[PDB]
Amino acid sequence: IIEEIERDEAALREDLYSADRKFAEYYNVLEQILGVLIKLVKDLKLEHQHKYN
Amino acid sequence: ESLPSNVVSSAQVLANVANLLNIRDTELSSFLVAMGDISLRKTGVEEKR
After folding, report:
1. A4 neighbors B34 (Cβ within 8 angstroms)
2. Which of A1, A2, A8 sits opposite B42 (nearest CB)?
3. Interface contact flag, B49 A15, Cβ < 8 Å
4. Which pairs with CB-CB distance under 8 Å and at least 24 residues apart come from B31-40?
5. Taking CB atoms and an 8 Å cut-off, how many pairs form between chains A and B?
6. Which terminus of chain A has a lower count of CB atoms within 10 Å, N or C?
7. Residue B9 CA from chain centroid, whole number
């Protein structure tokens, strides 16, 4: 029961715990799809090529 | 012949280690907190959020 309070808090946010981890686990794996497209203009590829065309 | 056999062996068996933090009344401290909220505190939000 003493640790059930922890379950009443840690397991209360257990879905909140894991979901935030996977909402933070995608900040880098998505960076190779979501974060490369910002890089795709920040790598000067389109910045020079909007001017290149 | 009855101090260790009866009153020590019945009053203190639920007084030594077990009921220190969940039986603070006759039998109800678990009912309203442990059974009451400590069973339900997670249930309060862990579906809404």
Report:
1. yes
2. A8
3. yes
4. B34/A1, B34/A4, B37/A8, B38/A1, B38/A4, B38/A5, B38/A8, B39/A4
5. 33
6. C
7. 19
